Amino acid sequence: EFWNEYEDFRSFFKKKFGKDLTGYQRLWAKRIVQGKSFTMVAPTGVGKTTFGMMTALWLARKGKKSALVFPTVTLVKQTLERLQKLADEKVKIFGFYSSMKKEEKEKFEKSFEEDDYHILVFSTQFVSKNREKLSQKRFDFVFVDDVDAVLKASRNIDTLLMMVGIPEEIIRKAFSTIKQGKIYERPKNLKPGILVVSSATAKPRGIRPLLFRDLLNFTVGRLVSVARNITHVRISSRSKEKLVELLEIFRDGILIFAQTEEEGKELYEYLKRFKFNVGETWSEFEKNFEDFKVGKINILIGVQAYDLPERIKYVIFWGTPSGPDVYTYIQASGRSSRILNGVLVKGVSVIFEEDEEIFESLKTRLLLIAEEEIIEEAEANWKELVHEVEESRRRSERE
């Protein structure tokens, strides 16, 4: 599935270029197989340009289109030259530079408007002067040789992002959101091209990288998503009464995770007895799950080891996931907090746990991994928590 593709590329490179992939070119190639956008940081000599060129070539096999962008006229000539000696004559490769032959230009220009091309090669000045025409193209791959040159104009950053299939409205909405110091999430139904930039110095400025990581399927930065706004509260008992009190104020959108299917059956019965609008996962998943998603049901009990942030507000753990399996705790609790319509909605997770040792393990681990704290019942401002939950959600639905 994924390794096969990488190797196909591996072989192709070896064959066409004449040598092996370098350590760096191998790391990069895997990325480009998982369709990841990235920033090339590496000292000059490693194999960046050659790789960007060979990538273009390989993608042109799948009929995919590329654009290669260099800071200087010499690099445009050089790369153009190499590319035309290396290509199967079937591959349509056009380049452009001011000092070009009038005949060669028109050839470019003709192919550029007819979209009869696979690989285009030009300079940062072409990008500056053809913002309109370029913005109307979707490329499967865009390689920018020295990004510090073209980063100079914010206008050009936009164009690049547009050349990979990202509509201006989305760039405007992302930039704006970042302006307000909030989180942007790219729409996952949009499948933009790959953007790879070479940075000579891993330059400082904060905005380009943010815009990029937000809009492009970038290399993963963090192990725990910044999109978590959750308070963890621990009650040191398995009291059903105490659970009932929490239910009484939580009221809606509640997930309960039992350690076993029996433990979850005992609770279900107890909550059905006290006439709570409840449902379980085991007997009839899809019916209950959709009643919960609708509103018909307020509480969904389930079992650890197995709907919508709109819907999930409160997560309750009837016993700590055994391990503690912190990974599962983190995923589950993370259900109660998700960016919704541009808003990082509020969530609350409560753990019923008698065992001090178990809970001490989960607690220290969670602080080490998520950097998130687990407070005791008595530190908990239920009124503020519930309010945060309701109001955060109420902002989201303003759309």
- Smallest distance from the beta carbon of 27 to ligand ADP, in angstroms? 12
Q: Give the strand pairing for 343-344 and 339-340.
A: antiparallel
114-173 binders of ligand ADP (CB under 6 A): none
| 50 binding ligand ADP? (CB under 6 A) | yes
User: Cα 101 vs. chain centroid, distance in angstroms?
Assistant: 44
Nearer to Mg ion, 49 or 288 (CB): 49
| Radius of gyration of the chain, Cα coordinates, nearest whole angstrom | 27
Evaluate whether 93 touches 80 at the Cβ level (below 8 Å).
yes
| 37 binding Mg ion? (CB under 5 A) | no
Closest CA to 69 of 11, 142, 13: 142
Q: Which does 20 bind (CB under 5 to 8 A by kind): Mg ion, ligand ADP, none?
A: ligand ADP
- Smallest distance from the beta carbon of 150 to ligand ADP, in angstroms? 16
Nearer to ligand ADP, 47 or 334 (CB): 47
Which residue in 9, 28, 39, 48 binds ligand ADP (CB under 6 A)? 48
Task: With contacts defined by CB under 6 A, name the span among 29-37, 48-56, 186-194, 342-350 that binds ligand ADP.
Answer: 48-56
Closest CA to 145 of 83, 218, 210, 76: 76
- Smallest distance from the beta carbon of 93 to ligand ADP, in angstroms? 18
Nearer to ligand ADP, 6 or 282 (CB): 6
- Smallest distance from the beta carbon of 48 to Mg ion, in angstroms? 5
Distance CA 339, CA 310 (A): 10
Q: Left, alpha or beta for 198 (phi > 0: left; psi -120 to 50: alpha)?
A: beta
Q: Which does 19 bind (CB under 5 to 8 A by kind): ligand ADP, Mg ion, none?
A: ligand ADP
Residue 98: CB partners within 8 Å, gap ≥ 6?
73, 125
Tokens of 260: 């076993």
Evaluate whether 382 touches 249 at the Cβ level (below 8 Å).
yes
Contact mark string toward ligand ADP, 6..35, x via CB under 6 A:
-------------xxxx--x----------
Distance CA 264, CA 122 (A): 64
Q: Residue 21: count other Cβ atoms within 10 Å of its Cβ.
A: 19
Q: Which does 45 bind (CB under 5 to 8 A by kind): ligand ADP, Mg ion, none?
A: ligand ADP
Contact mark string toward Mg ion, 47..66, x via CB under 5 A:
--x-----------------
Distance CA 216, CA 37 (A): 6
By CB under 6 A, the count of residues binding ligand ADP is: 13
Distance CA 178, CA 241 (A): 45
Task: With contacts defined by CB under 6 A, name the span among 46-54, 176-184, 239-247, 388-396 that binds ligand ADP.
Answer: 46-54
| 336 binding ligand ADP? (CB under 6 A) | no
Q: Which does 181 bind (CB under 5 to 8 A by kind): Mg ion, ligand ADP, none?
A: none
- Smallest distance from the beta carbon of 300 to ligand ADP, in angstroms? 54
Q: Residue 137: count other Cβ atoms within 10 Å of its Cβ.
A: 20
Distance CA 51, CA 45 (A): 12
Interface with Mg ion by CB under 5 A: which residues? 49
Interface with ligand ADP by CB under 6 A: which residues? 19-22, 25, 42, 44-50
